[PDB]
Amino acid sequence: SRYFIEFEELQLLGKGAFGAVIKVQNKLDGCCYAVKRIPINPASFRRIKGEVTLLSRLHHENIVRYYNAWIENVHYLYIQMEYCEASTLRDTIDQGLYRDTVRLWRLFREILDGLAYIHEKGMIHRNLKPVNIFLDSDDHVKIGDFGLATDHLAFEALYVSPEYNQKVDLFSLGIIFFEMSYHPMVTASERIFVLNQLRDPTSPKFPEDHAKQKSVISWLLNHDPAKRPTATELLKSELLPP
Numbered sequence: 259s260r261y262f263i264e265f266e267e268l269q270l271l272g273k274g275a276f277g278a279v280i281k282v283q284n285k286l287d288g289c290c291y292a293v294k295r296i297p298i299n300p301a302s303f304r305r306i307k308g309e310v311t312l313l314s315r316l317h318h319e320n321i322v323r324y325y326n327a328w329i330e331n332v333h334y335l336y337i338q339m340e341y342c343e344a345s346t347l348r349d350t351i352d353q354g355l356y357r358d359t360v361r362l363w364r365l366f367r368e369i370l371d372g373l374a375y376i377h378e379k380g381m382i383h384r385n386l387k388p389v390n391i392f393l394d395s396d397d398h399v400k401i402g403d404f405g406l407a408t409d410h411l412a413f414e415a416l417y418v419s420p421e422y423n424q425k426v427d428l429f430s431l432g433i434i435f436f437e438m439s440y441h442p443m444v445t446a447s448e449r450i451f452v453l454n455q456l457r458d459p460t461s462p463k464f465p466e467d468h469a470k471q472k473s474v475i476s477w478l479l480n481h482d483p484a485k486r487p488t489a490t491e492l493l494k495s496e497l498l499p500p
């Protein structure tokens with residue numbers, strides 16, 4: 259009702275393991291929003307209501323803007339967010355991010371910004387990857403899609419680390435940063451093999467074809483989490499623009 263009464267749908271934006279995200283217009287503002295709708299078994303889910311509570315409270319220029327969350331009668335939970343016009347980092351990676359080194363670095367920064375904020379509120383994303391990082395109409399990172407059935411209090415295989423510790427997201431960032439700083443990997447066999455190589459237990463292994471990027475991703479991907487830098491610690495490293 260509230261969904262259908264007050265919104266019109268425009269485009270399936272994505273489909274999750276749980277339920278979908280629909281780009282919609284609001285009747286009254288006329289504003290486009292993204293809306294996760296999840297089918298829900300009231301009493302089980304208590305996790306979810308938890309992560310809703312937990313995620314509502316996040317405010318950052320590098321998080322997707324929250325708007326509202328409600329339920330409609332037995333079934334569904336809706337979550338209304340900012341609709342980022344430039345889609346995902348994935349799209350941006352696949353259309354030649356490695357080319358623009360200036361842009362590459364800036365975005366990487368914004369992500370770190372986000373992770374720091376998340377980390378200092380005592381929180382972890384865990385489901386971090388380029389499909390889960392969006393881009394506003396001003397081409398700024400908006401991190402999102404935390405995972406509502408996933409605990410985010412600091413107490414799909416390629417982005418996960420070999421291990422609750424903030425170090426997990428910074429591993430993922432190395433995988434991500436690599437892809438940002440690399441040519442689009444046309445083949446699936448390519449994507450998969452190349453990244454399996456970044457995840458070499460003793461030491462990462464890279465393509466044959468960008469020198470500052472190496473040292474960073476090496477730091478980030480360190481198999482021992484204690485030799486990976488904090489979002490701020492790495493924001494402090496001299497290995498950085500602007």
Ligand SMILES: Nc1ncc(C#Cc2c(F)ccc(NS(=O)(=O)c3cc(Cl)cc(CO)c3Cl)c2F)cn1
Nearest residue numbers: 292293294313314324337339341342345402403404
């Ligand atoms: N282009 C484009 N594509 C997809 C989206 C999106 C989207 C979306 C969505 F529709 C619901 C939820 C989350 N993310 S969440 O992690 O579940 C979360 C939950 C709460 Cl309650 C609060 C916050 C931060 O306050 C977060 Cl991040 C979305 F990312 C936006 N643009």
